[PDB]
């Protein structure tokens, strides 16, 4: 087969690292770690990474490399009835692209807004500011009334978001042309990065996957030298071992590691499908997973040095400084830090460029998974003319993201990020692991891995894939189902119909798998036993 291959091994490694290293490594993991015991949380995170995310990462990489097919078509070679998984994954991508890119747009907007001599989120003198605004790092002579807001909070909520113009999820308001242009530029960059395939995405990730680390090192050096950063680092690391007793800590570690590594989104599979057959996907999986986890740790150091600095300038514990987190931590809290620190313009420019790149590499990977899946599944129509299909994918993602550009767009972004990554994607990943372990047989998968690498996976990997990784995903799914999210943003309690809409989004993502199972059973003739067996067995070309 004349299939495309990575120009260089570094291209694949950096593509995977950029995929797994997103803004979640920077603002999800550190907040979750501090909330769940700080240093103690490194014990769940590690454990659920060793027996959880990493086995699935390696399994997906090996599967994609061996079968050299995308998310949709690969199930022809593993378990045909589960072909619907592919389509489900595609839908998930859309939902992700509906909000993911929007967040990047915000960063881009901030980036542009950060090119001024004085950062616009520095003072309360601006048009968007209201009477509640008060300088965050003001002298103690002026008290911080509970109703007060910081200038950066005003800039985020009223200038860029204009959230004040939306009464909630029911009244999103109009579309902000500024964010519309920002996301249009974002999608132009995305398209022109992933329109010729891996031969261009691999080269683009050289900048989009390494630059975030350069900026992270710069920001770590900046924060470590800030006054009061040691207190922030101590809060980050001070272990609350009692938190390990709570099940919620382990639940959060599981969810964080799964959604950080991203095993089960059809993206690692698509990236591996371009690897050379005999390439070592075991080493690649280990290297990329440890890189992602260490990036999460280092970015937590970066964030919490600054949080401790901010907690020192205000005589407050880091708990009040962090508040509630979200994008409201890199756009309000950290943005306040940049505004206060010297050389604020340069640090803001690099910080928001880092956010843009951290998002861009992951979006490249997420959309490339879908593009590869469709290209492999329907080559008779898309094998050529790939550029126009990628254009169609980008246009569809932009149209899906239009709702997130409204003045109530932040509410929709939070809704999607809470429900797009709900138990639907976890169930899809669990069914992937089950199909490749039980239905396809762990022995056959290990034989394929031996044929690729030359050595069969050890008993640890077999046990993980067969029992623990499916059990890991099932544990997360049960956690998500038996605890609905009471999600809240900007003192706006989400309504119950929003929860029902999130359930609808999740099922629409997942309802592809049962629908295709029923379709495949119906089409295949024979009795029910044969009707099922003939479709479980991988098709032989």
């Amino acid at each position: 087969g004349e299939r495309e291959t990575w120009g260089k091994k570094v291209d694949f490694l950096l593509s995977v690292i950029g995929y797994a290293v997103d803004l979640g490594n920077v603002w999800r993991f550190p907040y979750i770690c501090y909330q769940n015991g700080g240093g103690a949380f490194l014990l769940p995170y590690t454990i659920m990474a060793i027996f959880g995310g990493i086995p699935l990462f390696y399994m997906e990489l090996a599967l994609g490399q061996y079968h050299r097919n995308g998310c949709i078509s690969i199930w022809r070679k593993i378990c045909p009835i589960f072909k619907g998984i592919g389509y489900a994954i595609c839908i998930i991508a859309f939902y992700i692209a509906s909000y993911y890119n929007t967040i990047m747009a915000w960063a881009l907007y901030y980036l542009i807004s950060s090119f001024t001599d004085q950062l616009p989120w520095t003072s309360c003198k601006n048009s968007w500011n209201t009477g509640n605004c008060t300088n965050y790092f003001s002298e103690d002579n002026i008290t911080w009334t509970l109703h007060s807001t910081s200038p950066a909070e005003e800039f985020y909520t009223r200038h860029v978001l204009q959230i004040h113009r939306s009464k909630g999820l029911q009244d999103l308001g109009g579309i902000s042309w500024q964010l519309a242009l920002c996301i249009m530029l974002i999608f132009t960059v995305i398209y022109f990065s992933i329109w010729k395939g891996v031969k261009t995405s691999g080269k683009v990730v050289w900048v989009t996957a390494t630059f975030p680390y350069i900026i992270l090192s710069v920001l770590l050096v900046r924060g470590a030298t800030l006054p009061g950063a040691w207190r922030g680092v101590l809060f980050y690391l001070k272990p609350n071992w009692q938190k390990l007793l709570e099940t919620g800590v382990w639940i959060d570690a599981a969810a964080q590691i799964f959604f950080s590594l991203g095993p089960g989104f059809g993206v690692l599979l698509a990236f591996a499908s371009y690897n050379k057959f005999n390439n070592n996907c075991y080493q690649d999986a280990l290297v990329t997973s440890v890189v992602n986890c260490m990036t999460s740790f280092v970015s937590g150091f970066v964030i919490f040095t600054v949080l401790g600095y901010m907690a020192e300038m205000r005589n407050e514990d880091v708990s009040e400084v962090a508040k509630d987190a979200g994008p409201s931590l890199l756009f309000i809290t950290y943005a306040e830090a940049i505004a206060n620190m010297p050389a604020s313009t340069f640090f803001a420019i690099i910080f928001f460029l880092m956010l843009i790149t951290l998002g861009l590499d992951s979006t490249f990977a997420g959309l490339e998974g879908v593009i590869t899946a469709v290209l492999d599944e329907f080559p008779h129509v898309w094998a050529k003319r790939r550029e126009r299909f990628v254009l169609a994918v980008v246009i569809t993602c932009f149209f899906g993201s239009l709702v997130t550009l409204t003045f109530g767009g932040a509410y929709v972004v939070k809704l999607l990020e809470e429900y797009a990554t709900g138990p639907a994607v976890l169930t899809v990943a669990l069914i992937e692991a089950v199909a490749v372990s039980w239905f396809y047989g762990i022995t056959q998968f290990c034989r394929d891995v031996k044929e690729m690498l030359g050595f069969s996976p050890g008993w640890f990997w077999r046990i993980c894939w067969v029992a623990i990784s499916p059990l890991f995903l099932l544990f997360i799914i049960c956690s998500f189902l038996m605890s609905p999210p009471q999600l809240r943003l900007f003192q706006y309690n989400y309504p119950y119909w929003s929860i029902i809409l999130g359930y609808c989004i999740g099922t629409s993502s997942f309802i592809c798998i049962p629908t295709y199972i029923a379709y495949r059973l119906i089409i295949t003739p024979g009795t029910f036993k044969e009707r099922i067996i003939k479709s479980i067995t991988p098709e032989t070309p």
Partner: antibody
Amino acid sequence: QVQLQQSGPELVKLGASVRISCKASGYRFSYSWMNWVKQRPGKGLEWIGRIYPGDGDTKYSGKFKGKATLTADKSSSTVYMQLSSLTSEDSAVYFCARSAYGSEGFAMDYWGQGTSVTVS
Amino acid sequence: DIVLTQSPASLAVSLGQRATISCRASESVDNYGISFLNWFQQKPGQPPKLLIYAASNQGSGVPARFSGSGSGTYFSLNIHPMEEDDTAVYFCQQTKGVSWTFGGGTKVEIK
């Protein structure tokens, strides 16, 4: 009770410069633009400029830059205005206003009694 | 520089009738859902008094008879009933641009 107290009536000669003061009270002084507005004897209001004492950021009208310079003194909660190279045209009543906040359209809610500058 | 054109330059009202003063902005003054156009009243020989602190919002202590309306480039101030105490010069100030130019002023006098 917000009270903007301005200087008394001022009489100056041609080509001189004058210091017009506006003392603010009743509100947090550093977080409100202080607008200076001109009003000639027979003509309407004529915005001169504004100063944010918090950052000390002054923005002037196109025809008043250089002619008028605003400054702030947070210790005394005062806003000062230099009119330079005063001519017969500058003879007018000058008002200082609090400018409310951005959410309220920067409305100049509170005003001073006005300083009558007579150039002769 | 946003230019506010008021109309009419002078306006005569029979006592108790409705007074309407129109303002046209060369550029839209709306921003973040806030019109950024204010209406002020000035009695002869007194400092201007804030009248409407937005396109619509009533200035603190302003009687309910005064009412602002409009948005974008066109705004209006309406007085109903026009009491004898309302004879004054009504100005409109745009707080949108860098320079907050005042309006030409409308002299409302009792007929």
